[PDB]
Scaffold this active site. Structure first.
Site, PDB file in Angstrom:
ATOM      1  N   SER A 199       0.450  -1.140   0.010  1.00  0.00           N
ATOM      2  CA  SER A 199      -0.123   0.008  -0.036  1.00  0.00           C
ATOM      3  C   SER A 199       1.184   1.510   0.094  1.00  0.00           C
ATOM      4  O   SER A 199       1.760   1.543  -0.674  1.00  0.00           O
ATOM      5  CB  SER A 199      -0.732  -0.004   1.573  1.00  0.00           C
ATOM      6  OG  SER A 199      -1.510   1.377   1.249  1.00  0.00           O
ATOM      7  N   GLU A 325      -9.290  -5.468  -3.831  1.00  0.00           N
ATOM      8  CA  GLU A 325      -7.980  -4.303  -3.135  1.00  0.00           C
ATOM      9  C   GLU A 325      -9.551  -3.282  -2.630  1.00  0.00           C
ATOM     10  O   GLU A 325      -9.081  -2.013  -1.916  1.00  0.00           O
ATOM     11  CB  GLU A 325      -7.687  -3.941  -4.117  1.00  0.00           C
ATOM     12  CG  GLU A 325      -6.933  -4.350  -4.599  1.00  0.00           C
ATOM     13  CD  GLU A 325      -5.188  -4.005  -3.549  1.00  0.00           C
ATOM     14  OE1 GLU A 325      -5.638  -3.704  -2.802  1.00  0.00           O
ATOM     15  OE2 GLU A 325      -4.843  -4.965  -3.198  1.00  0.00           O
ATOM     16  N   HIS A 438      -8.044  -5.493   1.108  1.00  0.00           N
ATOM     17  CA  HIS A 438      -7.019  -5.152   1.311  1.00  0.00           C
ATOM     18  C   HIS A 438      -5.868  -5.378   2.422  1.00  0.00           C
ATOM     19  O   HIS A 438      -6.210  -5.516   3.495  1.00  0.00           O
ATOM     20  CB  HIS A 438      -6.556  -3.215   0.843  1.00  0.00           C
ATOM     21  CG  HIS A 438      -5.540  -2.636   0.809  1.00  0.00           C
ATOM     22  ND1 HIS A 438      -4.546  -2.678  -0.320  1.00  0.00           N
ATOM     23  CD2 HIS A 438      -4.977  -2.208   1.899  1.00  0.00           C
ATOM     24  CE1 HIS A 438      -3.782  -2.165  -0.302  1.00  0.00           C
ATOM     25  NE2 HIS A 438      -3.916  -1.645   1.056  1.00  0.00           N
TER      26      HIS A 438
END
Ligand SMILES: *[C@@H]1O[C@H](CO[C@@H]2O[C@@H](C)[C@@H](O)[C@@H](O)[C@@H]2O)[C@@H](O[C@@H]2O[C@H](CO)[C@@H](O)[C@H](O)[C@H]2NC(C)=O)[C@H](O)[C@H]1NC(C)=O
Ligand SMILES: *[C@@H]1O[C@H](CO[C@@H]2O[C@@H](C)[C@@H](O)[C@@H](O)[C@@H]2O)[C@@H](O[C@@H]2O[C@H](CO)[C@@H](O)[C@H](O)[C@H]2NC(C)=O)[C@H](O)[C@H]1NC(C)=O
Ligand SMILES: *[C@@H]1O[C@H](CO[C@@H]2O[C@@H](C)[C@@H](O)[C@@H](O)[C@@H]2O)[C@@H](O[C@@H]2O[C@H](CO)[C@@H](O)[C@H](O)[C@H]2NC(C)=O)[C@H](O)[C@H]1NC(C)=O
Ligand code: HI6
Ligand code: HI6
Ligand code: NAG
Ligand code: L0S
Ligand code: L0S
Lengths: 529, 532
Positions: A199, A325, A438
């Site tokens: 991320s 995601e 995610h």
């Protein structure tokens, strides 16, 4: 025990021995690599740690950099696993080193982990970033650092000398410089450093790829569910100055840059955290107040510009995403969503969620999104709208920015390997409608399932060792394959990637090529005209 | 003398002929004058009704085709020659035809009125494919068909002028429908059950009669085949209409703009062929599916643009049946699209695809062109020649026919009109066009008119049973406003369910969505782009 004794260049260190189900490892936690950026050094670039006498206690994790703490689902393991597990302080610039036991006598490939957290949160001390399993199973040296987040890391008054911005990024670079001068004392090989992050961590990795001072400090990159070129990882100089100026107003300090930041330096760290989220222009998801700034220094241009113009021959990268995601971000502001729910939203809620998920764009741009993500044969099916909205924020913020990075670097010299992580952990506390959210591939890459203290299945542990070998093969050779179905490199034409789950490797084409032709090819033309 | 071949209408007395059909006798009255010839001083003017005559008028064969262009691209090719004039060209051409059962019906009988297509620049009621003997013979209806002025003779407009007010080809149709109301009962037809039906520009014309109140009172139902009044080709604004008329006059020699009366009068002195030879040089760009002289949105015939009239209209008590064929855009690509030909497989490159997109969608910004490329590119196979070939034909078909037909159908249904929709998916055994073209535009017509029952033709057996089934479908809608037989059912088309049926040799198959995803782009998003 002489193995727990290391002399780095600042002085001597005392480590600790840790157990794994496969044998012991050596760990050195809380190694100071910078002078504490407190008082008059708040917002300033990091300074190298001055040498110390005596022995530094390197047996426990140090403090977490001051950050917001999620309060939405108190006590829920899905949210608290990302919350800080140590006390907060601006004195937080420490790194951790894991090597096999006994320490290697030959140069060992090094892996440097950069955590995510939207540049506003995160810590190297989290349980899911425990490097003991990777180091024992794959015999590498794992390093992880703490960098400043939020205003302390990325508040920029562009042109100022007292708040130049991106100081959280120079924290990471200073740690990477610390690696090059000191990792050999732990048995590491400074000539084979592999950056990897997830991320905002993955975004931070890519920004080191496009900053020449950082390029000489590592050799490969793994970008998981993040990229420097997205719509959330960077901010312009003008918007950075507006946000820094409003936060100062919200904390009672008067909008001259030097007196402005001097007044900010008199505020307790907690009060800055309490207001950082209210300088955002619009109610949003996947938007963060203080991110890296594009000001010509760390990045001479925007990440897209440097990606398109760069020569990437001689670089290998590993990039990928999870299956869903977007799922996870919509319980934080999308109308009608909740984890204790089916979140079967209506069209009104869907369209309302599109302006939240795609913020700060014209009405025409928003309608273009709706047209692409509407099934006009089933225009109001709540189940379809739930998943379409998750695709919107998932494609816009992660899948498409990563697909573009993969395509450009591949077409410009780099060898790229692409994956999509398609296994839902048996221990997942999130509802099923969220799928594979995610960030929930990290625990498998760090071999967390091997911890017998946890409830992972036998196949899941085998799966964790499969991916540790993939990642370690890439760190060692720039190729995740075992010299079995082979993992082909991603190219702009074939667009080949593999799926990571309990099944053997499956090769597929196109990272949502249809949906990301929209975000990467058409939309930029729409906004500029 | 045969009493069944003598009919008295208002203008005077007529005599017809007896046509032999496979099924039986049909009385035909071909070449009935309904307007004074629009020649010389009457050119570009609205039609005046035919003055009464003494004696008997021999309405016994098709009259001349209204002056129009002749296609020369594939000379001698059956696929092109079937649309070309089969009678002499002349400005004296406002004649209609009437087919009726032999003997004439005892009681009033529903009336079908055909309006041919041809991009408002060509067409004629005399084409073999529009022979109405089989329809009248098989379904016992009365078929009316008329000629109307095309090209500059029918739609050259200098808006506001009295000497060339424009849309005169439409008032030709309107006067013909006024003739039907006053005279069809003399043939046994019912003036209170009259069903319009046309194809392509004919279907666009049929739709414009829906939206102009003076026309709407002359018929009761409508059938729109592969055309709609809201397509980007069927109308033109007042200004561009004046620009095309003015430069047409310039290219031919008038004046040596200025005064409208003066300019039109000079155009009248020019031979009809000279006007036809120059009318295509006024188109603003290289294009396909664009026509120089078409109905103009001037506030008279159409008080507003067709889309706004459709959206603002109340259509309760109104039944229409709309549809398209399976591969609508293929026919038009061999007329300008780079890399296309009926003699090749037309496996174009991507460079020719992108160039073809600008021809298929002319007069749009660069942003709109790339929006088209985005939705019709397969980004996993961006340069496959075969996929690019069908992508371009989808571009042309959806933009000009399918989506225009889809929006009209959806807005009518939502606003009180019972709609039925179909897609014609049968490729005729006798088709001359190559295989890659599929079922091209305009080739459902011959099955609607029952042409396969002509014994001189070599249609298969099943295509004859097919033609009989569709003729029955069309006649049932004419009589009852519902194509269903009083076998699987044909459900109405609604904006929600969007149901339509497939028309081929197998039984009816119900389906949803007329390229809903594709046409949501054309009907919902793209109109928002060109504004901003
Ligand atoms: C799903 O629940 C959401 C979220 O509501 C919260 O969580 C639920 C489990 C329940 O405890 C609610 O009372 C909580 O507020 C619902 O979206 C909310 O709906 C309420 C009305 O029911 C409304 O007042 C709130 O503004 C909504 N909040 C948001 C963020 O949209 C939603 O109705 C539920 N969906 C279902 C049941 O299908
Ligand atoms: C446009 O021209 C017509 C025609 O004008 C006549 O013929 C021309 C050759 C020229 O020589 C003029 O002088 C002629 O009058 C005009 O229409 C005529 O207008 C006049 C005066 O108003 C009138 O007496 C005639 O009856 C009209 N003839 C028609 C209608 O056929 C018209 O006024 C001109 N428009 C302008 C100049 O704006
Ligand atoms: C396929 O056909 C088109 C049409 O060209 C004509 O028809 C062919 C059947 C053949 O008889 C050609 O010689 C004719 O010219 C071809 O496109 C044309 O190619 C020529 C040759 O360079 C060029 O001069 C024209 O401008 C082209 N016309 C258009 C509309 O683009 C095409 O090359 C043929 N072959 C293939 C493989 O596509
Ligand atoms: N100033 C900020 O960037 C910020 C953003 C979000 N939060 C709270 O976290 C919400 N959240 C927490 C975890 C995951 C996603 C999200 C949604 N973000 O929009 C605090 C500060
Ligand atoms: N009057 C003219 O000059 C003219 C020129 C070209 N066209 C277009 O003809 C080519 N074409 C293009 C598309 C479909 C059919 C056809 C042929 N019709 O006869 C019409 C009129
Ligand atoms: C998961 O592990 C915890 C340990 O705290 C245990 O209490 C729990 O029973 C386990 N769950 C299952 C399903 O075994
Ligand atoms: C560390 C993983 N998490 C939380 C699930 C996030 C939000 N990572 P990233 O910075 O997304 C912007
Ligand atoms: P339409 O008017 N119809 C055409 C071109 N046609 C020839 C195949 C059928 C009569 O096109 C706009």
């Amino acid at each position: 025990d002489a193995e727990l004794l290391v002399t780095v260049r600042g002085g001597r260190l005392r480590g600790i021995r840790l157990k794994t189900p496969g044998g012991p490892v050596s760990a050195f936690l809380g190694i100071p690599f910078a002078e504490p950026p407190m008082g008059p050094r708040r917002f300033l670039p990091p300074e190298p740690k001055q040498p110390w006498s005596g022995v530094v206690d390197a047996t426990t994790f140090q403090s977490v950099c001051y950050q917001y703490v999620d309060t939405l689902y108190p006590g829920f393991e899905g949210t608290e696993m990302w919350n800080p597990n140590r006390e907060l302080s601006e004195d937080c610039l420490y790194l951790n080193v894991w090597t096999p036991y006994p320490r290697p006598t030959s140069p060992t490939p090094v892996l440097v982990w950069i955590y995510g957290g939207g540049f506003y949160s995160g810590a190297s001390s989290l349980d899911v970033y425990d490097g003991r399993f990777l180091v024992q199973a794959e015999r590498t040296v794992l390093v992880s650092m703490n960098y400043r987040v939020g205003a302390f890391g990325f508040l920029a008054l562009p042109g100022s000398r007292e708040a130049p911005g991106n100081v959280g990024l120079l924290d990471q670079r200073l740690a990477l410089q610390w690696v090059q001068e000191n990792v050999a004392a732990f048995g590491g090989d400074p000539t084979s450093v592999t950056l990897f992050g997830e991320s905002a961590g993955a975004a931070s990795v890519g920004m080191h790829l496009l900053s020449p001072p950082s390029r000489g400090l590592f050799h490969r990159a793994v970008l998981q569910s993040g990229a420097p070129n997205g719509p959330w990882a960077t901010v312009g100089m003008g918007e950075a100055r507006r946000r820094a100026t409003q936060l100062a107003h919200l904390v009672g300090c008067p909008p001259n840059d030097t007196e402005l930041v001097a007044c900010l330096r008199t505020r307790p760290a907690q009060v800055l955290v309490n207001h950082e989220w209210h300088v955002l222009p619009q109610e949003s998801v996947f938007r963060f107040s203080f991110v890296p700034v594009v000001d010509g220094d760390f990045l001479s241009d925007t990440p897209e510009a440097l990606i398109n113009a760069g020569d990437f021959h001689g670089l290998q990268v590993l990039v990928g995403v999870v299956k869903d995601e977007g799922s996870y971000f919509l319980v934080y502001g999308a109308p009608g969503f909740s984890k204790d729910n089916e979140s079967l939203i209506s069209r009104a809620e869907f369209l309302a969620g599109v302006r939240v998920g795609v913020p700060q764009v014209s009405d025409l741009a928003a309608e273009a999104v709706v047209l692409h993500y509407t099934d006009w044969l089933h225009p109001e099916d709540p189940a379809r709208l739930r998943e379409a909205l998750s695709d919107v924020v998932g494609d816009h913020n992660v899948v498409c920015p990563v697909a573009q990075l993969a395509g450009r670097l591949a077409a410009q010299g780099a060898r790229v390997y692409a994956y999509v992580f398609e296994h839902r952990a048996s221990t997942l506390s999130w509802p099923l409608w969220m799928g594979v959210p995610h960030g929930y591939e990290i625990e498998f890459i760090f071999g967390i399932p091997l911890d017998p203290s946890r409830n992972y299945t036998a196949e899941e542990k085998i799966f964790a060792q499969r991916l540790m070998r993939y990642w370690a093969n890439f760190a060692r050779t720039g190729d995740p394959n075992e010299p079995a179905p082979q993992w082909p490199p991603y190219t702009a034409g074939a667009q080949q990637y593999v799926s990571l789950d309990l099944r053997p490797l499956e090769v597929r084409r196109g990272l949502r090529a249809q949906a990301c032709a929209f975000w990467n090819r058409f939309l930029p033309k729409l906004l500029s005209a």
